[PDB]
Amino acid sequence: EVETFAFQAEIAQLMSLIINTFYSNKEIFLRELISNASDALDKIRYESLTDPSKLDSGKELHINLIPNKQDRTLTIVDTGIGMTKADLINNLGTIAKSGTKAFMEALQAGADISMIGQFGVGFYSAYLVAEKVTVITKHNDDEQYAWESSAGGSFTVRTDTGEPMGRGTKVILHLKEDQTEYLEERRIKEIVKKHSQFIGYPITLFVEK
Numbered sequence: 001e002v003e004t005f006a007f008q009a010e011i012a013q014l015m016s017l018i019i020n021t022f023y024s025n026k027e028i029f030l031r032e033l034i035s036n037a038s039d040a041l042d043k044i045r046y047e048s049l050t051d052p053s054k055l056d057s058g059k060e061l062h063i064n065l066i067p068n069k070q071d072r073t074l075t076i077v078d079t080g081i082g083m084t085k086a087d088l089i090n091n092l093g094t095i096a097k098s099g100t101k102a103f104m105e106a107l108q109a110g111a112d113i114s115m116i117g118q119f120g121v122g123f124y125s126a127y128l129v130a131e132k133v134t135v136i137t138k139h140n141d142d143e144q145y146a147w148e149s150s151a152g153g154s155f156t157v158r159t160d161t162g163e164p165m166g167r168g169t170k171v172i173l174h175l176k177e178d179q180t181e182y183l184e185e186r187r188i189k190e191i192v193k194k195h196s197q198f199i200g201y202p203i204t205l206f207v208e209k
């Protein structure tokens with residue numbers, strides 16, 4: 001049972017800008033997605049101090065980076081707070097509308113795409129390198145969902161019947177044909193060292209079989 005939704009026009013416009021603008025410094029996507037994972041881990045850690053049972057779904061707080069050359073995917077996995085169905089359909093986008101407007105204005109004033117994270121819409125930097133993004137996510141007291149979008153103005157949400165995650169989020173980047181460098185161990189290591197070397201959770205870079 002797959003539900004299809006339209007992005008708000010402002011968010012669709014942002015996605016088109018990210019896809020269409022000439023901008024060579026694409027590697028910043030990884031810092032943004034790792035920071036999102038870190039934020040999610042911070043949140044479940046903080047909530048667990050007043051309600052320890054929130055970690056019944058898993059105590060380990062960490063990030064995995066998983067390249068797969070056969071599938072042409074780079075997956076960023078965290079065991080953070082996860083996202084609810086309400087997040088995926090309504091609430092993240094409602095918040096994102098103002099950040100998108102501010103980001104657009106900053107760009108017109110001379111900012112560049114690498115500053116996208118300051119506006120709360122760094123997630124969408126995924127589309128610098130991915131033709132499709134699939135997000136599998138599980139929040140306590142909600143179901144496991146798959147969100148997906150290839151841009152073009154729409155996204156889908158379905159209940160996920162794949163392998164149960166416990167709690168957290170997998171961001172699966174289906175890479176563009178000319179962006180397979182982000183499947184290489186040396187390249188990912190370089191980017192993590194340059195931009196994400198003080199993240200306060202273990203980051204395990206898997207190697208390709």
Ligand SMILES: C/C=C/Cn1c(Cc2cc(OC)c(OC)c(OC)c2)nc2c(N)ncnc21
Pocket residue numbers: 036037040078080081082083088092093096120121122123135147169
């Ligand atoms: C400021 C938004 C936080 C939501 N979030 C994102 C980024 C994100 C995911 C989203 O959906 C998967 C978004 O809406 C499409 C979105 O809109 C700005 C942002 N990653 C994660 C993550 N790993 N774990 C828990 N929450 C997350």
